[PDB]
């Protein structure tokens, strides 16, 4: 797995400043709102016939953070992300039967929520860095869809 060194730092800088309590909920909210099919694994968590509710649904806040903390575990093991996520990857499939394209949508909403926070700090360079990381981890989590 190739990682230039600027890349390393960027994903390090990014994962240092980022408010997992803010972001996380916001990013799962937008993906449930922007890609309402992904809601099939967060249905009965409250009136999903609502943005404002979804936004402010507890259930949803929580898993979003798990998501971000979960991405943390790969921010350390930057050279073996697969083995890292293989469990989680073997989980989301056999356990909750999740559509691994969904992992695509959510990363995007993350990358887009993240953007709104760094604002003008989120450089093109910063976007690539952040985005290729997200990509890499994404094969990882759909890996054991078998």
């Amino acid at each position: 797995v190739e990682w230039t060194d600027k890349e390393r730092s960027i994903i390090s800088d990014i994962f240092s400043h980022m408010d997992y309590d803010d972001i996380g909920p916001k990013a799962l909210s937008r993906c449930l709102i922007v890609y309402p099919w992904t809601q099939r694994h967060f249905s009965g968590f409250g009136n999903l016939y609502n943005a404002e509710a979804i936004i402010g649904n507890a259930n949803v806040a929580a898993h979003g953070i798990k998501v971000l903390h979960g991405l943390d575990r790969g921010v350390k093991n930057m050279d073996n992300i697969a083995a890292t996520y293989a469990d989680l990857s073997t989980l989301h499939s056999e356990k909750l039967h999740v559509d691994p394209d969904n992992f695509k949508l959510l990363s995007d909403c993350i990358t887009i929520v993240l953007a709104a926070k760094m604002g003008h700090a989120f450089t093109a360079e910063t976007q690539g860095a952040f985005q290729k990381f997200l990509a890499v981890v994404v094969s990882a989590l759909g890996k054991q869809y078998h």
Partner: protein, 142 residues
Amino acid sequence: SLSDKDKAAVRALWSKIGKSADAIGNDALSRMIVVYPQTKTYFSHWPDVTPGSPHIKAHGKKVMGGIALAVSKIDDLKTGLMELSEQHAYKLRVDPANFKILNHCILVVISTMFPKEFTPEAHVSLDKFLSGVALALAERYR
């Protein structure tokens, strides 16, 4: 968008091949979960999921019905297909990414089964109609 020619294309082709659409939907369905097991998240409710599966035999039937329908609504797929939409979109929350795959397989079962009729011309036209269908199927999403 579909042209007069494309529409003729896909209606010619459906005329020659439609006789075996049951036949066509079993394997195209067979191939989707084999070649793309990730799509099994869905039919994992099924008592039987391997090709050979009478559940699969039976459902492939359905999907080409649906594609019989869509050929009959080709001038207005969005309207023709709204009940199918809301099912796959509202109820079944399928991901639109998955429509691309069964069409791929539909594209490939047809070529095996109707090599000489599946012209490159026939193809570019059925392919547009298939996304065309994917688009109609996705009306009820967001």
